[PDB]
Motif scaffolding. Structure first.
Motif, PDB file in Angstrom:
ATOM      1  N   UNK A   1      31.494 -38.382  12.548  1.00 34.67           N
ATOM      2  CA  UNK A   1      30.194 -38.956  12.088  1.00 34.67           C
ATOM      3  C   UNK A   1      29.023 -38.076  12.476  1.00 34.67           C
ATOM      4  N   UNK A   2      27.851 -38.392  11.941  1.00 35.44           N
ATOM      5  CA  UNK A   2      26.655 -37.637  12.272  1.00 35.44           C
ATOM      6  C   UNK A   2      25.614 -38.554  12.937  1.00 35.44           C
ATOM      7  N   UNK A   3      24.792 -37.999  13.858  1.00 33.94           N
ATOM      8  CA  UNK A   3      23.877 -38.807  14.680  1.00 33.94           C
ATOM      9  C   UNK A   3      22.930 -39.689  13.869  1.00 33.94           C
ATOM     10  N   UNK A   4      22.438 -39.172  12.743  1.00 34.29           N
ATOM     11  CA  UNK A   4      21.588 -39.949  11.841  1.00 34.29           C
ATOM     12  C   UNK A   4      22.298 -41.167  11.248  1.00 34.29           C
ATOM     13  N   UNK A   5      23.569 -41.001  10.886  1.00 33.78           N
ATOM     14  CA  UNK A   5      24.382 -42.089  10.341  1.00 33.78           C
ATOM     15  C   UNK A   5      24.635 -43.156  11.412  1.00 33.78           C
ATOM     16  N   UNK A   6      24.960 -42.705  12.622  1.00 38.82           N
ATOM     17  CA  UNK A   6      25.105 -43.591  13.779  1.00 38.82           C
ATOM     18  C   UNK A   6      23.804 -44.357  14.009  1.00 38.82           C
ATOM     19  N   UNK A   7      22.688 -43.630  14.086  1.00 41.83           N
ATOM     20  CA  UNK A   7      21.378 -44.238  14.339  1.00 41.83           C
ATOM     21  C   UNK A   7      21.062 -45.347  13.334  1.00 41.83           C
ATOM     22  N   UNK A   8      21.280 -45.044  12.052  1.00 40.52           N
ATOM     23  CA  UNK A   8      20.966 -45.965  10.958  1.00 40.52           C
ATOM     24  C   UNK A   8      21.918 -47.167  10.956  1.00 40.52           C
ATOM     25  N   UNK A   9      23.211 -46.904  11.118  1.00 42.01           N
ATOM     26  CA  UNK A   9      24.226 -47.969  11.194  1.00 42.01           C
ATOM     27  C   UNK A   9      23.935 -48.970  12.304  1.00 42.01           C
ATOM     28  N   UNK A  10      23.557 -48.467  13.480  1.00 43.81           N
ATOM     29  CA  UNK A  10      23.358 -49.334  14.641  1.00 43.81           C
ATOM     30  C   UNK A  10      21.974 -49.969  14.673  1.00 43.81           C
ATOM     31  N   UNK A  11      21.082 -49.485  13.813  1.00 43.55           N
ATOM     32  CA  UNK A  11      19.729 -50.031  13.717  1.00 43.55           C
ATOM     33  C   UNK A  11      18.806 -49.485  14.789  1.00 43.55           C
ATOM     34  N   UNK A  12      19.156 -48.316  15.323  1.00 47.50           N
ATOM     35  CA  UNK A  12      18.396 -47.673  16.398  1.00 47.50           C
ATOM     36  C   UNK A  12      17.115 -47.012  15.876  1.00 47.50           C
ATOM     37  N   UNK A  13      16.039 -47.098  16.660  1.00 53.91           N
ATOM     38  CA  UNK A  13      14.737 -46.546  16.267  1.00 53.91           C
ATOM     39  C   UNK A  13      14.739 -45.023  16.130  1.00 53.91           C
ATOM     40  N   UNK A  14      13.771 -44.502  15.375  1.00 47.11           N
ATOM     41  CA  UNK A  14      13.675 -43.066  15.094  1.00 47.11           C
ATOM     42  C   UNK A  14      13.545 -42.209  16.350  1.00 47.11           C
ATOM     43  N   UNK A  15      12.874 -42.736  17.370  1.00 42.17           N
ATOM     44  CA  UNK A  15      12.680 -42.005  18.623  1.00 42.17           C
ATOM     45  C   UNK A  15      14.000 -41.686  19.345  1.00 42.17           C
ATOM     46  N   UNK A  16      15.050 -42.464  19.069  1.00 38.99           N
ATOM     47  CA  UNK A  16      16.355 -42.256  19.706  1.00 38.99           C
ATOM     48  C   UNK A  16      17.102 -41.043  19.140  1.00 38.99           C
ATOM     49  N   UNK A  17      16.568 -40.459  18.066  1.00 33.83           N
ATOM     50  CA  UNK A  17      17.196 -39.316  17.394  1.00 33.83           C
ATOM     51  C   UNK A  17      17.498 -38.133  18.321  1.00 33.83           C
ATOM     52  N   UNK A  18      16.537 -37.782  19.176  1.00 32.71           N
ATOM     53  CA  UNK A  18      16.703 -36.675  20.126  1.00 32.71           C
ATOM     54  C   UNK A  18      17.895 -36.912  21.052  1.00 32.71           C
ATOM     55  N   UNK A  19      17.982 -38.128  21.592  1.00 30.80           N
ATOM     56  CA  UNK A  19      19.104 -38.538  22.441  1.00 30.80           C
ATOM     57  C   UNK A  19      20.413 -38.410  21.708  1.00 30.80           C
ATOM     58  N   UNK A  20      20.439 -38.904  20.479  1.00 33.29           N
ATOM     59  CA  UNK A  20      21.657 -38.908  19.673  1.00 33.29           C
ATOM     60  C   UNK A  20      22.097 -37.501  19.272  1.00 33.29           C
TER      61      UNK A  20
END
Ligand SMILES: CC(C)(COP(=O)(O)OP(=O)(O)OC[C@H]1O[C@@H](n2cnc3c(N)ncnc32)[C@H](O)[C@@H]1OP(=O)(O)O)[C@@H](O)C(=O)NCCC(=O)NCCS
Ligand SMILES: CCCCCCCCCC(=O)OC[C@H]1O[C@@H](O)[C@H](N)[C@@H](O)[C@@H]1O
Length: 323
Positions: A1-20
């Motif tokens: 998987x890719x971090x953006x797909x994970x972020x979007x699937x889990x409903x995580x905020x945009x700021x979490x992108x760097x962490x992911x």
């Protein structure tokens, strides 16, 4: 998987992108992530003093690599991001973000699964350091306390103090009786021990406090001889001398704070930064109207009286020499 797909699937905020992104570059752990299941999981949860109600729910909702791919991706890498700093107190306590509760029980209990998956690694570290098993387990039982706190505070199962459990899981924090001690360093790099008071374990009785203080130097000089701390530092609402206005001589806080040497300046009266801390620890405050908070104890009455009067509580910092 890719971090953006994970972020979007889990409903995580945009700021979490760097962490992911960081977790993507880190990748999966060398030792595959394993969750205990069934009675094994129930035995471990009970050893960690997780209340029966939550433990049942935790076991029931345990995620699956196939049906929960985004969650699993994150669980593996978050585990990895913690164990990479095993024994390292100079690393910041990054446990990862909480998961939006729209993901259900697996999302609410995410960091419990992180903790469970990381128990074998930290227990191996305890063993390598020669830490007694009883101390290792006693330390890890704060998981249960923090699970219980989530439910008291919010009304359903969860554990959103994952930043704090990175200390237990990196083997840099140990419960030594009533108090906990963390491997720490000042800004100038000088070793000290952070002193902490977990909620569970009853009142901060002088004899229990004193026993813990006596355990600190022998424990760390034996198992972390390279550290060499001579002083314990504490930062807490507890060290606020304003409490003396409200609490009597029988107060454990009052009696014991008398041994401490405060090192920060008298704070500005208008500084409101310490209000949220005392409200967390006295009430597990979650935005309620103030006069609808309990008033059973002298401290509960104190916190509210002081605030109603237009006054503010302050975190104070001090030290005590290790016996
Ligand atoms: C640290 C702790 C164990 C101290 O409790 P203690 O030893 O009873 O403290 P004291 O003897 O000074 O308490 C004085 C009074 O306030 C009450 N009190 C103490 N801590 C309280 C708390 N967190 N919430 C509500 N009431 C509290 C006591 O019951 C006592 O009441 P009384 O005078 O009406 O009989 C307790 O405050 C606690 O569990 N806090 C949560 C953990 C914490 O704050 N850690 C530090 C984070 S920086
Ligand atoms: C008067 C008795 C001794 C006063 C020194 C008190 C130092 C306590 C500091 C402390 O307990 O803080 C650490 C906390 O870190 C929080 O964020 C965690 N939520 C909490 O678990 C932990 O206690």
């Amino acid at each position: 998987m890719d971090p953006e797909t994970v972020r979007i699937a889990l409903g995580l905020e945009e700021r979490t992108a760097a962490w992911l992104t960081e977790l993507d570059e880190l990748g999966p752990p060398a030792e595959p992530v394993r969750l205990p299941r069934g009675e094994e999981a129930r035995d471990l949860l009970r050893r960690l003093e997780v209340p029966e109600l939550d433990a049942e729910e935790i076991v029931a909702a345990a995620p699956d690599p196939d049906r929960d791919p985004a969650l699993w991706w994150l669980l593996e890498r978050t585990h990895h991001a913690i164990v990479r700093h095993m024994g390292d107190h100079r690393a910041k306590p990054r446990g990862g973000p909480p998961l939006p509760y729209e993901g259900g029980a697996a999302a609410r209990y995410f960091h419990v699964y992180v903790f469970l998956a990381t128990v074998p690694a930290v227990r191996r570290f305890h063993a390598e350091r020669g830490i007694p098993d009883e101390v290792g387990w006693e330390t890890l039982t704060q998981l249960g306390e923090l699970v219980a706190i989530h439910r008291r505070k919010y009304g359903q199962g969860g554990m959103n103090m994952q930043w704090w459990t990175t200390y237990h899981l990196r083997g840099i924090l140990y419960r030594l009786g009533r108090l906990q001690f963390s491997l720490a360093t000042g800004k100038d790099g000088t070793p000290h021990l952070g002193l902490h008071v977990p909620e569970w374990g009853g009142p901060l009785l002088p004899k229990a406090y004193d026993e813990s203080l006596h355990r600190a130097r022998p424990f760390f000089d034996r198992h972390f001889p390279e550290h060499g701390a001579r002083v314990a530092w504490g930062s807490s609402w507890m060290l606020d001398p304003q409490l003396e206005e409200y609490l009597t001589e029988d107060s454990n806080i009052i009696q014991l704070a008398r041994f401490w040497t405060l090192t920060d300046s008298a704070p500005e009266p208008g500084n409101a930064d310490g209000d949220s801390s005392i409200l967390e620890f006295v009430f597990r405050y979650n935005g309620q109207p103030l006069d609808e908070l309990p008033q059973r104890s002298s401290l509960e009455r104190a916190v509210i009286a002081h605030l109603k009067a237009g006054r503010h509580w302050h975190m104070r910092t001090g030290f005590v020499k290790l016996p």
